Amino acid sequence: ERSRESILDATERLMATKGYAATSISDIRDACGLAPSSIYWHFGSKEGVLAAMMERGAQRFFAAIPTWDEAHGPVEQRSERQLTELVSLQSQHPDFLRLFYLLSMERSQDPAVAAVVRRVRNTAIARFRDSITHLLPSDIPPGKADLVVAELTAFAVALSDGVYFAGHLEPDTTDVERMYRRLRQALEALIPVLLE
Amino acid sequence: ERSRESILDATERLMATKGYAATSISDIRDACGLAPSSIYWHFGSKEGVLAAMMERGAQRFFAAIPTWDEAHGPVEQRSERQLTELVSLQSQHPDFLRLFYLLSMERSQDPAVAAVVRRVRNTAIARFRDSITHLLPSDIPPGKADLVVAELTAFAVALSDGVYFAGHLEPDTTDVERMYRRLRQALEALIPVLLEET
Ligand code: NA
Numbered sequence: 013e014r015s016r017e018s019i020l021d022a023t024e025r026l027m028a029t030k031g032y033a034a035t036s037i038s039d040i041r042d043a044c045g046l047a048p049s050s051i052y053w054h055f056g057s058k059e060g061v062l063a064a065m066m067e068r069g070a071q072r073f074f075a076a077i078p079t080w081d082e083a084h085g086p087v088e089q090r091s092e093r094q095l096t097e098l099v100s101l102q103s104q105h106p107d108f109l110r111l112f113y114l115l116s117m118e119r120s121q122d123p124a125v126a127a128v129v130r131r132v133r134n135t136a137i138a139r140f141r142d143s144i145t146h147l148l149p150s151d152i153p154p155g156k157a158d159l160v161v162a163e164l165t166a167f168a169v170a171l172s173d174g175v176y177f178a179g180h181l182e183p184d185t186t187d188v189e190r191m192y193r194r195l196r197q198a199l200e201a202l203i204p205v206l207l208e
Numbered sequence: 209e210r211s212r213e214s215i216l217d218a219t220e221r222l223m224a225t226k227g228y229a230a231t232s233i234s235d236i237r238d239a240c241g242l243a244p245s246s247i248y249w250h251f252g253s254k255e256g257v258l259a260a261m262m263e264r265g266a267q268r269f270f271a272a273i274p275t276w277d278e279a280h281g282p283v284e285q286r287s288e289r290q291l292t293e294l295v296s297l298q299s300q301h302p303d304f305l306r307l308f309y310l311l312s313m314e315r316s317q318d319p320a321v322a323a324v325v326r327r328v329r330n331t332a333i334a335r336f337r338d339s340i341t342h343l344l345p346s347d348i349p350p351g352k353a354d355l356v357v358a359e360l361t362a363f364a365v366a367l368s369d370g371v372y373f374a375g376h377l378e379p380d381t382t383d384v385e386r387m388y389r390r391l392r393q394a395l396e397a398l399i400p401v402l403l404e405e406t
């Protein structure tokens with residue numbers, strides 16, 4: 013819908029400017045022109061707006077990174093982009109990232125929000141899993157591979173989570189590209205260890 | 209002195225139940241018997257209390273792990289309980305940890321809170337750095353060591369941050385001990401890599 017996008021657009025700018033608490037459903041109307049009843053009719057509530065806002069922020073973050081089959085090149089890589097995008101995709105668009113980590117720790121969470129948080133986290137995990145499976149030798153038995161891949165994935169996701177906070181808490185001295193370089197180097201080193 | 213402790217104790221329990229939002233200065237009095245005016249006089253405000261409580265939780269988290277110099281004797285070398293002490297304390301807090309990440313991302317928060325967050329983060333970084341220096345060969349030129357230790361530390365702290373969220377978002381399938389073992393193994397692998405790159 014054209015109207016759904018209007019609301020989210022307004023909600024982004026308003027919360028960026030005023031923060032969550034001080035952003036009214038009324039304010040959102042003032043910005044997007046849509047009446048509160050129309051807003052409620054779409055997202056059901058303020059939290060329902062926040063969720064949908066946060067989700068499509070994810071959908072764009074992930075689309076800006078190609079999957080492994082979205083490639084291209086003779087397995088250049090198939091790092092290239094995947095790290096390069098991930099690197100550039102932390103440049104003051106954590107945005108959605110900060111919101112994610114905030115919402116992940118929220119207590120007594122609205123169902124719509126908890127569902128969005130879960131889908132985003134699962135997606136991120138799935139995406140790392142897609143890349144990492146290609147770091148293993150092909151002659152590894154699939155069941156054994158599943159265990160190794162799952163453990164490397166959990167490791168990478170953890171490190172990537174840490175990268176946001178490093179950039180947030182130590183923005184001056186943090187090198188995002190360098191850190192993800194150490195990650196892939198760490199993963200390549202851990203593969204022989206895991207198969208032992 | 210004893211008054212500060214009973215205020216924080218009451219504030220913990222009240223904030224374990226109830227939400228931060230729904231915990232009033234009034235409620236805190238009801239629990240600890242100290243008047244609101246006495247509470248303010250100590251911590252200055254509600255978020256002023258929140259800070260002090262979160263810091264105290266960190267100081268206890270950090271004391272529960274030894275520094276390299278105070279650790280044992282030299283066998284482990286000194287790490288594998290500094291490991292399990294780190295593993296001991298997840299266990300999935302707060303205590304402090306969830307509050308820390310929440311407060312670290314809070315906007316326009318409060319001078320006293322931002323200071324606590326900064327001290328806790330810096331301490332944790334300092335603690336990892338203290339351990340990691342002994343992973344390097346003795347003959348590395350100090351200035352070059354400083355660069356390598358710093359990069360390994362940033363890496364370790366990042367991984368440790370992610371370990372919390374793994375345990376939070378995937379509590380069923382997350383092995384905390386196994387993860388910190390992979391961190392140690394990763395750090396040992398990265399040391400030669402870092403030294404040949406200066
Ligand atoms: Na209108």
Ligand code: NA
Binds near residue numbers: 045046047050
């Ligand atoms: Na309308």
Ligand code: NA
Binds near residue numbers: 344345346347
């Ligand atoms: Na040595």
